[PDB]
Amino acid sequence: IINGEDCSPHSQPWQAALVMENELFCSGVLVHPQWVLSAAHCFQNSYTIGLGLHSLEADQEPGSQMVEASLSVRHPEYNRPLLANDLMLIKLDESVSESDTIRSISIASQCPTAGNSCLVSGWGLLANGRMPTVLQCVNVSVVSEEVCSKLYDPLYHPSMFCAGGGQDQKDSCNGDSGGPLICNGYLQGLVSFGKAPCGQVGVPGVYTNLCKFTEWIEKTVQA
Amino acid sequence: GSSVVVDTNGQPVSNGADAYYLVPVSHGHAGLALAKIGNEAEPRAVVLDPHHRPGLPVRFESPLDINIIKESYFLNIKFGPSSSDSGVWDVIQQDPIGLAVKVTDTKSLLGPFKVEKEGEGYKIVYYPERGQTGLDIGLVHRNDKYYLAVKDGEPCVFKIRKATDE
Ligand SMILES: [Cl-]
Ligand SMILES: [Cl-]
C-alpha cells in the first residue's frame, strides 16, 4: 500500500494473509466462515491462511488463527481475456469461529460508482520499496469506466474497474494482490494489477469487479 | 504453470524488485551481453558471451500486484534498473539470425515471455501475440556470436541466480 498508514488494529477483520514458507505472497478476504475470496492469479495447490492478523507474526497476535486449505476454485473464465475474471474461492479445511477480529464481509451487489472514495488494505510494498510490519490502509477513489478503458484498452474488461491515480499517489502495490477494496461498507473489489510503478499520478490501479460475480460466488459456496 | 519460479537458493523470484542472472546450466562460463546484429551501429541483440560471467542481470516483470513470479505469467524481461525502460527484451525478425532477442526502449503492459521449467532449470519461451503457442529461446551461432533467438525444441536452459554480488 503506497502512501497509506497503519490500519487501526483489527479494523479490517475479513483480511486474510496467504503465506508460503512463512512469507506473505497475497491477501484474500473472508466472505463466509469456510471461504476466502482472493485473486485467481494467487492460485496454489494448497494454502496456509492467516486470519485475525495485524502484524504477520501469529505468535504475537491473540485471537489469530493460521488455517490450512487444500481446495480452491478459479473463476472458469479467468484470463480469457488476459488478466480478466481475476477471482478464486478457497475453501478452508474447517469453518472458523468468527469473533471481533475474524469476521466475514458482505459483497456489493451494485456496481462501483465513479468518483466514490473506497478503502484498500494490505501488507504489500510501501513507497520506499520495503514491506510494512503491520497491515496498511489507504483510500483510493473509483475512476469512470471511460477513463479505465482509455488507459487500459485493449485489456480493460468489465470484470475489472479502476481506482486511484490521484495527485495524492495513493495506490495498492506488489504483495497487495487479492486483498479487499471496500466501498460504502461492502466488499467491492480485489486488488488485481496495474501499470508499474505504483502510485503514479493519473494512473489508477485495477481491481476485480466483484458485483459481476455474486451469482458464481453464491453457487460455488453452496455447491 | 502454478509453480512458482525459484532462484538458485530456492527462494521465489521477485516481480521486478530484484535482479537475477540467467546462468546457462551447461555454459556457466558464459553470460548474457549485448552485441551488434545486421548493419546496426549500436549493440541491441542479446548474446551469450564466453567473455562475461555471470553476464548482465535481468528483472522479470508482471503487472499483477503480486511480488513473486509463476511459470504461467506473461512477463517482460529487462536489463537495467526497475526505474528504466531501456533494456526491455522483445523478439524481432532479423536475417539471418531468425527471430532474434533484442532490446527496445518501450514496454507493453504485458510482456510476451514466460519462464518454464525445463530439465535442471528453466527455459525462456516467447509467445507471439501473447497467444497459446510458445517458441523456445535457444542459441543461433552467426558472425562468431551465439545469439539468443527462437530455436523451437532446442531451448537454452538456465538457472536463476539472485544478483546480490552487486
Ligand atoms: Cl549457484
Ligand atoms: Cl538490412
Curated annotation (Swiss-Prot), chain A:
Q: Where in the cell is it found?
A: Secreted
Ranges that cross the membrane: none
Q: Which GO terms of type biological process are on file?
A: amelogenesis; biomineral tissue development; extracellular matrix disassembly; protein maturation; proteolysis
- Enzyme Commission number(s): 3.4.21.-
Function statement: Has a major role in enamel formation. Required during the maturation stage of tooth development for clearance of enamel proteins and normal structural patterning of the crystalline matrix.
Question: What gene name does this entry carry?
Answer: KLK4
UniProt note on tissues of expression: Expressed in prostate.
Q: Which domain of life is it from?
A: Eukaryota
Organism of origin: Homo sapiens
The active site lies at H41 (charge relay system), D86 (charge relay system), S177 (charge relay system)
Keyword ATP-binding assigned to the entry: answer is no
UniProt keyword list? Amelogenesis imperfecta, Biomineralization, Disulfide bond, Glycoprotein, Hydrolase, Metal-binding, Protease, Secreted, Serine protease, Signal, Zinc, Zymogen
- An annotated GO cellular component: extracellular space
**Family matches, as InterPro entries:** Peptidase_S1_PA, Peptidase_S1_PA_chymotrypsin, Peptidase_S1A, Trypsin_dom, TRYPSIN_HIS, TRYPSIN_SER
Note whether Cytoplasm occurs among the keywords.
Answer: no
| UniProt-annotated binding residues for Zn(2+) | H10, E61
The entry assigns this protein to a family as follows: Belongs to the peptidase S1 family. Kallikrein subfamily.
Peptidase S1 domain segment(s): 1-222
Cysteine pairings via disulfide bonds: C7-C137, C26-C42, C111-C211, C118-C183, C148-C162, C173-C198
Annotated protein name in UniProt: Kallikrein-4
